[PDB]
């Protein structure tokens, strides 16, 4: 319609004026870039913007028809945006802010989730043996006492050692008392006394990961059995639910299920070996677990639920905190890094805050974050803003000098001198000159340096690693002359010289191997080489080789 009217003239004249296009342009508000998009869309069939009123047609109809169809779509469009920052503001402008009480609920949800996870990992106490072994090795002076554990939930090493002694006593009195009615109570008491301790995040995560590896091994075995008993044998799931579940340890559910007088039971004969190996691995692991796998399964389910609750909790905290970072980031727009990059770097510092924030101390987040965010923006501007990376320390020093220099200029009405800068700062003066040399950003090799031929700066930079052609001809001339002066000699001495220096060969053989082939003991071959040299030395055999002696 309106666009079609604009096309009408375009073609009728073969050209149009910026004003007429902008006016006929659909009222459809366009965010500049959109207007930019359509201008080329019109340029697709070919048109002259010409801010003023006015050279041949070379446009394929296929391009033309496609541009026409997309042009029609532009009118039917509503809010098409080809700009990432704008899209980001919109997708972010869809989450409400949180009030002061709005972090307490989230924080307690996080604390409850992590407490559930801690108890669930606590229920599986087999790790306690690993913790005890680590403590024993540490007490063997393999590591620091305070590095293994960040204290306990109590403040002195003697108390920690007493608690470790009690833990070991309970472990030994519970492990050796399985014989079952009361063993569960002993295990519960052991877990409860272990709950009073506090572990470093790295060791706790390692224990969790080891447990996950064991559980994934068990799950791999179970799924291998399932695929070897269902896909190959079409074993009804009802049989698996009835037999495998309930015991989960013996071979009765599989080995003794072969006599069920069913086709799948008979077909299990072919795959009995691999499933039997899987059962053997499980029996061992089931013994290693020493706990009903179903109970473990429920432990993992509860842990997953707690982790999901914690993750979605912070999610909302970080959505309001994305609402932020946009402010701090705008403070470094022209610092050598692009805005969306600054914002995304801040979002990571924000995540780091939310996970390390304690509401008990009642800090305004908007303050336990406005730092973590700026630290992450500046760290980035320092580690990936220059093509030639500079250490954070050198960047700090350079910024300090650029400041101390501004003040000295304002109070001296004159740029300071490498000497006065050294005096005002605390640097050996030569260090100042070194830091005042760290070349600024590389120049663009396409920088226009023209007005005659439209030539760029990179066109005038020469290649310095090239051999001149009179040096390649000179080299071949020596490679020949040498053959003459040398050939003008007897065979054995010529080969001695050839081997010693490497003429026509692939190694500068030392005297030992030359003697091996020529049978001798160095001193003679040394003798043969020296005669040759003094010989080729006299005039009448070394005039052209002399010429090759630059002088």
């Amino acid at each position: 319609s309106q666009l079609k009217l604009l096309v009408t003239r375009g073609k009728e004249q073969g050209y149009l004026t910026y004003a007429e296009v902008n006016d006929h342009l659909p009222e459809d508000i366009v965010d500049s870039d959109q207007i930019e998009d359509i201008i080329q869309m019109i340029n697709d069939m070919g048109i002259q913007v010409m801010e003023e009123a006015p050279a041949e047609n070379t446009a394929d109809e296929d391009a033309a028809e496609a541009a026409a169809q997309v042009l029609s779509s532009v009118e039917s469009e509503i809010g098409r945006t080809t700009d990432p920052v704008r899209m980001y503001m919109r997708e972010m402008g869809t989450v409400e802010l949180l009030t002061r009480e709005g972090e307490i609920d989230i924080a307690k949800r996080i604390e409850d989730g992590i407490n559930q996870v801690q108890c669930s990992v606590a229920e599986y106490p087999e790790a306690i043996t690993y913790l005890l072994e680590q403590y024993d090795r540490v007490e063997a002076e393999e590591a620091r006492l305070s590095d293994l554990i960040t204290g306990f939930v109590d403040i002195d090493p003697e108390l920690a050692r007493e608690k470790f002694a009690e833990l070991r006593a309970q472990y030994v009195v519970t492990r050796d008392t399985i014989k079952h009615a009361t063993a569960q109570e002993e295990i519960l008491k052991l877990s409860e006394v272990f709950k009073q301790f506090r572990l470093v995040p790295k060791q706790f995560d390692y224990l969790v990961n080891s447990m996950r590896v064991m559980m994934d091994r068990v799950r791999t075995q179970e799924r291998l059995i399932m695929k070897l008993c269902v896909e190959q044998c079409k074993m009804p799931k009802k049989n698996f639910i009835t037999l495998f579940t309930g015991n989960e340890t013996s071979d009765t559910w599989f080995n003794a299920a072969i006599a069920m007088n069913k086709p799948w039971s008979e077909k299990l004969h072919d795959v009995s070996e691999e499933v039997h190996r899987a059962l053997q691995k499980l029996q061992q692991i089931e013994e290693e677990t020493g706990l009903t796998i179903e109970q473990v399964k429920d432990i993992n389910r509860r842990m997953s639920i707690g982790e999901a609750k914690a993750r979605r909790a912070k999610k909302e905290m970080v959505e309001a905190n994305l609402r932020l970072v946009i402010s701090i980031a705008k403070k470094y727009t022209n610092r050598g890094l692009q805005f969306l990059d600054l914002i995304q770097e801040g979002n990571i510092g924000l995540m780091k805050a939310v996970d390390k924030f304690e509401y008990r101390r009642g800090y305004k987040f908007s303050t336990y974050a406005t730092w973590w965010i700026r630290q992450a923006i500046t760290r980035s501007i320092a580690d990936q803003a220059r093509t030639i990376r500079i250490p954070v320390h050198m960047i700090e020093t350079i910024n300090k000098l650029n400041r101390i220099s501004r003040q000295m200029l304002q109070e001296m009405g004159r740029e300071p001198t490498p000497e006065e800068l050294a005096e005002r700062m605390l640097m050996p003066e030569d260090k100042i000159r070194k830091v005042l040399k760290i070349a600024k950003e590389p120049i663009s090799m396409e920088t226009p340096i023209g007005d005659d031929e439209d030539s760029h700066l990179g066109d005038f930079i020469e290649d310095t690693t090239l051999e001149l052609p009179l040096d390649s001809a000179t080299t071949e001339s020596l490679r020949a002359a040498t053959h003459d002066v040398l050939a003008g000699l007897t065979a054995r001495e010529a080969k001695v010289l050839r081997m010693r220096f490497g003429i026509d060969m692939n190694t500068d053989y030392t005297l030992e191997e030359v003697g091996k082939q020529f049978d001798v003991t160095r001193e003679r071959i040394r003798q043969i080489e020296a005669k040759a040299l003094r010989k080729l030395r006299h005039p009448s055999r070394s005039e052209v080789l002399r010429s090759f002696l630059d002088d």
Partner: protein, 46 residues
């Protein structure tokens, strides 16, 4: 150099009413009610 819009918009943006716009731009022909009109000899040039 933006999109053009009708001129009168700006006048309305300057706190002008339609009556004032017409008073500024156009002259006035009066009519009386029988059905008599005042005539100015110069107006009916042709």
């Amino acid at each position: 150099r933006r999109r053009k819009l009708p001129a009168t918009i700006i006048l309305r943006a300057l706190n002008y009413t339609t009556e004032q716009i017409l008073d500024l731009f156009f002259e006035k022909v009066i009519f009386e009610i029988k059905l008599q009109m005042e005539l100015v000899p110069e107006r009916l040039r042709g």
